[PDB]
Amino acid sequence: MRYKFLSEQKEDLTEAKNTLFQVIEEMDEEMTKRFNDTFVQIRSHFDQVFRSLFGGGRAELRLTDPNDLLHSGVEIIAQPPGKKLQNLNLLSGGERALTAIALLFSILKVRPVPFCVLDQVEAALDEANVFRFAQYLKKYSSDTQFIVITHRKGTMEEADVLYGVTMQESGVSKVISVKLE
């Protein structure tokens, strides 16, 4: 037997499908355009941010598949000063960490924030590179307040103030503070 309520349910399905399909395609359009637009902007800063952190060299961003703007990966190719230009996959541990930080700081030029909490992001930097990282922060702290959790002494040396967190009593953190600037 055929039922009216079932036939209406099938018509409601067909009707919703037509609108929902249009929602989905517009979402796809927004994601492809915004991804590409933002990628272009981040790429525009990347070489300069890399160079200021490494003190030299050069670097590039490239879409893995530029005709698949919904799924393409991003290739990072970088040349630390004194080394060859290579995919990020083949750089040293400390070079990889600093290049990733260069990408994060390039994103911050495109999508600025009034404050930025960095929790030990520079843990894997080679010691020789810490001072340019720390000086980057001081320089651009005119536009972004930086709150930096760190165990690298070079980063501490460029901060304006230090908060020390230590357990004087067992399992209870105490906080002291000293100005440097």
């Binding site: 099938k10 393409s72 991003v74 994103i107 009034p114 909490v117 709150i147 930096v148 967190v165 399992g171």
Partner: protein, 199 residues
């Protein structure tokens, strides 16, 4: 806009009140390993409405509230208050200084306040989302982000660029529509099966 003060009481390892006054430039947080300096980051995430337990390095009530030590018995309340300078009206609130407060009680009850007025978690989340400081903003960056960039799977790296592009709300709406389609078809399928057993 900038962070003025972080007040922390009973949150994780901060058994008694601490109060961090930030400067406008670079504030560094330092100290021996395990002594709690990354609980500062967790407290900032938590009061701004983070609910991911992974993001909080422990986000359940027993992780949030000071659980006790040799030095002290556990507490029954954790509280964090972040005070922000809003002189430039970066946040859409008609107040010179904006305070956000989060509390959780051992009993499981939670309280949220903006400028000492009770509100919902959603009101804190929406306040920062509307001003460009939501989930996709890079206002809090831990080592996990570096790991995603350095990942060998291309989906992990693309994710960083999608956050920067602000695509999450479009992706979520697309998935919401795809789920509506699926569940509508599934309900019809189940109705037809019930009806078919009636024949």
């Amino acid at each position: 806009m900038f962070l003025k003060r972080l007040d922390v009481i009973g949150f994780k390892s901060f058994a008694e009140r601490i109060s961090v006054d930030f400067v406008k430039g670079v504030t560094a947080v330092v100290g021996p390993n395990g002594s709690g300096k990354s609980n500062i980051t967790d407290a900032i995430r938590w009061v701004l409405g983070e609910q991911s337990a992974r993001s909080l390095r422990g986000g359940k009530m027993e992780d949030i509230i000071f659980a006790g030590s040799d030095s002290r018995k556990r507490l029954n309340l954790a509280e964090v208050t972040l005070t922000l300078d809003n002189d430039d009206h970066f946040l859409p609130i008609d107040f010179h200084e904006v305070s956000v407060t989060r509390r959780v009680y051992r009993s499981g009850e939670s309280e949220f306040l903006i400028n000492n007025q009770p509100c919902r978690l959603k009101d804190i989340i929406d306040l920062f989302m509307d001003s460009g400081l939501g989930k996709e903003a890079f206002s809090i960056i831990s080592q996990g982000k570096v790991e995603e960039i350095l990942s060998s799977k291309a989906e992990d790296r693309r994710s960083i660029f999608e956050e920067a592009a602000g695509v999450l709300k479009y992706k979520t709406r697309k998935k919401k529509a795809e789920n509506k389609l699926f569940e509508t078809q599934d309900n019809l399928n189940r109705v037809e099966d019930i009806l078919h057993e009636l024949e």
